[PDB]
Enzyme design. Sequence first.
Site, PDB file in Angstrom:
ATOM      1  N   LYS A 114      56.562  72.615  60.472  1.00  0.00           N
ATOM      2  CA  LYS A 114      55.922  73.742  59.805  1.00  0.00           C
ATOM      3  C   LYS A 114      56.079  75.023  60.622  1.00  0.00           C
ATOM      4  O   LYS A 114      56.439  76.075  60.081  1.00  0.00           O
ATOM      5  CB  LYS A 114      54.442  73.448  59.564  1.00  0.00           C
ATOM      6  CG  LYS A 114      53.635  74.641  58.999  1.00  0.00           C
ATOM      7  CD  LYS A 114      52.215  74.222  58.617  1.00  0.00           C
ATOM      8  CE  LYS A 114      51.438  75.340  57.917  1.00  0.00           C
ATOM      9  NZ  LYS A 114      49.993  74.975  57.721  1.00  0.00           N
ATOM     10  N   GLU A 132      58.134  69.046  71.157  1.00  0.00           N
ATOM     11  CA  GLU A 132      58.758  67.746  70.937  1.00  0.00           C
ATOM     12  C   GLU A 132      59.903  67.853  69.943  1.00  0.00           C
ATOM     13  O   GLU A 132      61.017  67.371  70.196  1.00  0.00           O
ATOM     14  CB  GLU A 132      57.704  66.743  70.438  1.00  0.00           C
ATOM     15  CG  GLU A 132      56.658  66.345  71.472  1.00  0.00           C
ATOM     16  CD  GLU A 132      55.314  67.081  71.379  1.00  0.00           C
ATOM     17  OE1 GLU A 132      55.251  68.262  70.978  1.00  0.00           O
ATOM     18  OE2 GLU A 132      54.287  66.457  71.745  1.00  0.00           O
ATOM     19  N   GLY A 165      49.722  70.228  57.761  1.00  0.00           N
ATOM     20  CA  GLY A 165      50.704  69.251  58.209  1.00  0.00           C
ATOM     21  C   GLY A 165      50.384  67.834  57.745  1.00  0.00           C
ATOM     22  O   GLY A 165      51.272  67.093  57.315  1.00  0.00           O
ATOM     23  N   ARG A 166      49.123  67.429  57.848  1.00  0.00           N
ATOM     24  CA  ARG A 166      48.770  66.056  57.493  1.00  0.00           C
ATOM     25  C   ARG A 166      48.579  65.897  55.987  1.00  0.00           C
ATOM     26  O   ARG A 166      48.246  64.795  55.514  1.00  0.00           O
ATOM     27  CB  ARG A 166      47.512  65.611  58.269  1.00  0.00           C
ATOM     28  CG  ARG A 166      46.354  66.608  58.194  1.00  0.00           C
ATOM     29  CD  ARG A 166      45.138  66.174  58.993  1.00  0.00           C
ATOM     30  NE  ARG A 166      44.097  67.194  58.973  1.00  0.00           N
ATOM     31  CZ  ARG A 166      44.129  68.331  59.649  1.00  0.00           C
ATOM     32  NH1 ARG A 166      45.107  68.606  60.496  1.00  0.00           N
ATOM     33  NH2 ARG A 166      43.135  69.196  59.502  1.00  0.00           N
ATOM     34  N   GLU A 191      42.211  63.551  62.227  1.00  0.00           N
ATOM     35  CA  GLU A 191      42.473  64.939  62.586  1.00  0.00           C
ATOM     36  C   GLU A 191      41.785  65.910  61.642  1.00  0.00           C
ATOM     37  O   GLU A 191      41.544  67.059  62.021  1.00  0.00           O
ATOM     38  CB  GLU A 191      43.967  65.234  62.596  1.00  0.00           C
ATOM     39  CG  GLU A 191      44.317  66.584  63.206  1.00  0.00           C
ATOM     40  CD  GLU A 191      45.820  66.800  63.283  1.00  0.00           C
ATOM     41  OE1 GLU A 191      46.474  66.927  62.212  1.00  0.00           O
ATOM     42  OE2 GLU A 191      46.343  66.843  64.426  1.00  0.00           O
ATOM     43  N   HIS A 223      44.878  36.790  62.026  1.00  0.00           N
ATOM     44  CA  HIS A 223      45.245  36.019  63.199  1.00  0.00           C
ATOM     45  C   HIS A 223      45.321  36.863  64.457  1.00  0.00           C
ATOM     46  O   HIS A 223      45.904  36.422  65.439  1.00  0.00           O
ATOM     47  CB  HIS A 223      46.609  35.381  63.000  1.00  0.00           C
ATOM     48  CG  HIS A 223      46.743  34.604  61.747  1.00  0.00           C
ATOM     49  ND1 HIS A 223      46.642  33.230  61.731  1.00  0.00           N
ATOM     50  CD2 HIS A 223      46.966  34.990  60.464  1.00  0.00           C
ATOM     51  CE1 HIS A 223      46.791  32.804  60.486  1.00  0.00           C
ATOM     52  NE2 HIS A 223      47.016  33.849  59.706  1.00  0.00           N
ATOM     53  N   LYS A 233      48.071  71.209  74.980  1.00  0.00           N
ATOM     54  CA  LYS A 233      49.337  71.922  74.966  1.00  0.00           C
ATOM     55  C   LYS A 233      49.392  72.977  76.062  1.00  0.00           C
ATOM     56  O   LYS A 233      50.424  73.144  76.710  1.00  0.00           O
ATOM     57  CB  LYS A 233      49.544  72.567  73.601  1.00  0.00           C
ATOM     58  CG  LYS A 233      50.110  71.614  72.568  1.00  0.00           C
ATOM     59  CD  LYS A 233      50.263  72.304  71.224  1.00  0.00           C
ATOM     60  CE  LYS A 233      50.549  71.322  70.104  1.00  0.00           C
ATOM     61  NZ  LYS A 233      50.339  71.967  68.755  1.00  0.00           N
TER      62      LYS A 233
END
Lengths: 555, 552
Positions: free
Chosen positions: B210, B216, B271-272, B357, B388, B518
């Site tokens: 965005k 990253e 973003g999410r 978030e 399990h 950050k």
Amino acid sequence: AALTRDPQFQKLQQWYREHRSELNLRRLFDANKDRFNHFSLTLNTNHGHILVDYSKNLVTEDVMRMLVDLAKSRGVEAARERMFNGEKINYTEGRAVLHVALRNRSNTPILVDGKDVMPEVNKVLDKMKSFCQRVRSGDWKGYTGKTITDVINIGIGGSDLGPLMVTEALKPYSSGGPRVWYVSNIDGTHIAKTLAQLNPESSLFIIASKTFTTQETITNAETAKEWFLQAAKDPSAVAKHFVALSTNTTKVKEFGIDPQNMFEFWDWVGGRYSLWSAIGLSIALHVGFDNFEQLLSGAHWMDQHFRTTPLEKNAPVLLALLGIWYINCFGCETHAMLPYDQYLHRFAAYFQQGDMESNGKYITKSGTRVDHQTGPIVWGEPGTNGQHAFYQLIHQGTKMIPCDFLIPVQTQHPIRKGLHHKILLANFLAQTEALMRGKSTEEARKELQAAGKSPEDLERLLPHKVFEGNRPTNSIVFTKLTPFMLGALVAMYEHKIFVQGIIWDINSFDQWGVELGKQLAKKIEPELDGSAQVTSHDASTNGLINFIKQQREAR
Amino acid sequence: AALTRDPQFQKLQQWYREHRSELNLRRLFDANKDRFNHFSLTLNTNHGHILVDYSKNLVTEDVMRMLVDLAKSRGVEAARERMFNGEKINYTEGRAVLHVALRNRSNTPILVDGKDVMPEVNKVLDKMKSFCQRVRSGDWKGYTGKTITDVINIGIGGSDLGPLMVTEALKPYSSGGPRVWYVSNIDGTHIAKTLAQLNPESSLFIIASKTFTTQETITNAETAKEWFLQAAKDPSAVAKHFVALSTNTTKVKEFGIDPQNMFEFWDWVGGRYSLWSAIGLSIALHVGFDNFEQLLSGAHWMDQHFRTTPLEKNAPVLLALLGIWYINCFGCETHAMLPYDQYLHRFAAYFQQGDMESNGKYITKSGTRVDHQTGPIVWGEPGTNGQHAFYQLIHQGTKMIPCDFLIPVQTQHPIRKGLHHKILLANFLAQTEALMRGKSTEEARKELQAAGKSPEDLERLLPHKVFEGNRPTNSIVFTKLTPFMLGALVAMYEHKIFVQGIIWDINSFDQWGVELGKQLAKKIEPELDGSAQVTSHDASTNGLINFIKQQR
């Protein structure tokens, strides 16, 4: 319950009520320049160092002395010797607990019922070594004379998670090994999408099941065999393409696997502690038996550290006690495991089983109900990805979440002259520092002033920009993620879980809590068949079933 | 804070304190054989049915009344209308919140700053439609004339998790699509092991960001471009192999992407909440643009269900309120999501971001600090595997854990004449029945006696075989996991999260909590270069940095 009655526990509780307010990390590090040295451990394994830095936890030196006094009071050391000595400490099932015997490279005798288990452990290890040599070299041929290119582990839970997490983590070590696939879910998607990518002629199936009765694994195994015989049309070809990892010789034969094709383990290998046994065959096949021996060796080293180290400097004991402090005094429900390593992307899921199935317990050794919390919910994803998914809640939500951060100093992939790993390490370091330090209203106000915000705009945003901090973490740093070092790390957490269990007075090694779901599914299965409405359960179970039956033939 | 002073919330907590011990599921079902019909919803989307069965929850008819009253008192409906009408409800950032516009198949105008956003939404959709047709047909060629066989999304967080979870969920619909790869971690393992499996002549890189400034993602993109140019030796050929999904045309161009190759979205796409925008291009390339539209259509249907349905029968509102009940009255820290579907193996991971978030917040709309819990920790793995691994703790631990169990009635892989899916369904049904019905001392004793246990074996084992039950679940059952149905299910949870944010009086749509990490990583970065000790931080950060320096 034992723990509640323990005088050291009550002193810890009492101290927590009086002094909880003195536990601000910002202040503690300012008043003790030596805090890191005092609240950290460096382990030289001879095959890498491990730094266990627990200094960003909400403890003082008094708190750690009280926590070590609790481990003494609860008999951690004597419980440890009972495990290593082969005593039947799995008291509900009447079993020894000897995953330590599986990696006992010293071959010092370990007696169960007065009989040394190490001859049989080493006989099976020799059998895996030889089979792995033959498969990997191409000397083991499929039924049309081809070498094996794909190995498929069919198993669930303890017979799946360990081998998958280790082969994921040691992928750099699999040059010249077959591809490995893990089919576990009964959901037919799993086996179907796997078989569609395979050639029966070059595929070796491994049926992993301690009991060799688990419905998902046996059904998956029968589906794979039907698919295989569709191609090979010759029952004798099964002996070249199916082996079994089990304790149950009778059921392995009844499934049609040759007895020479069965790799045995023992009842004192718990499934969630089983990757060190024959269940690890898919690991040895993928990365080679020599790397599997290194894995065992690294666990052996940690076993010895756990056994010979005074409690106050003993890595798994200290991690355990920190968790007790957060669980039983602070009330934290969860424990996040955050490896800064894409190869460890299945590590948290592995310790969901290892931790939660072990200590998600509520009855004590004496039969009485606990009156305190036991094991936490374990969760997590690799960094840095988690920073962009859920760290928002860790920094600025309303939960206290103890976090273990893990990273290797050396990357398997030093691309761009180390640029990516430098950024990774810096985020790793930054996040625990941020969790600890936070950011005050005064610090955030100064930032908004410098950004040029109007007084109105600044007062509006300011409280949203504040980080209350004081959020505790563990930082575990190791030289490189080799097989040896993975083994040491997994064993560290196995013994952490063991120590917590002793402290709580629960059985870390049974799992009676899975039985009821199994029973009720067996009752429901034959009711699903027809179009007849089901009315024999509670109203919700009936209603769900009848909806399922209705929607079966919607197009 | 708003919530704790609300009259309906206080009424709610007071009832909890007085009647908590009256809430036993075993007795609630025994006494009301109609409990399923009154505490479930059946939705016909016309593209599959959804049963939301919330009857195995610790609720009575009175509790549900008080919860709907809380929703009305906290103003959920008016907040919902602000969102759909394009108001700037993301108040810290001053932005609208219009993921619903991205999937507004109806094309009813939605105004932002007085201007309808729908033409720009549809312009971008048309562009993805045409690009996907060309790539999937082989019309779009690489720098040596070959068809694209591999598509690599480079992006993190909201630019990764949605498209990854959807392409994983809709694998059966990808025949004839290029293979899709997701690169997100800065950890060089991630791009290195992907690139080692790719042919530069036939690989298409999507840089999803965005901001187009995330460290990253830009680093990974630079590494992939270096790798690509080492093979092509023709900088004009980047235009055949690199596209960008972003709101920042400046940074996209400065990076080297042709303007023709940028797929736009807008600041009001969180973003999410972004997989419905250009960020979904890797979905549409993998399964085709028509399946992408079907995914959008499912979300659109759920948006209209949310918008037009009275609260007492409104699926995301009911799920939200049940969460409020467990969070703010029972004090449950976590919410498990347990899809009985291997294709949904990244569904819980997606909602870790979607939920945590959004509502991992502690400052209300008036700038005051919350004095109550907000968002839970979301976790889970697919069934039956989870049974399990960790269900031992759900059944016999000391934690109360609200769980959503999800399953499709019809499987994409009806192998063995449906035998596998039959077992999967039986386990889905059994586990929630077991969590609700424990097993008493009395019932366990009878089993052991019947098994033939001696009095000494029996009395030693008996207490460990008792299940206290009374553990609440939702069961969400849907006809089939199609693109449409996946879109509806995802949007349902998006609106769940919204409703909880409104009730908590927090901002579901900002994420200021990612900023301090950050900042600090930018200051630590240059300090790793030297061999010198570092002394500029707290002792622990210093001590870790110096151990890293020792062990290189």
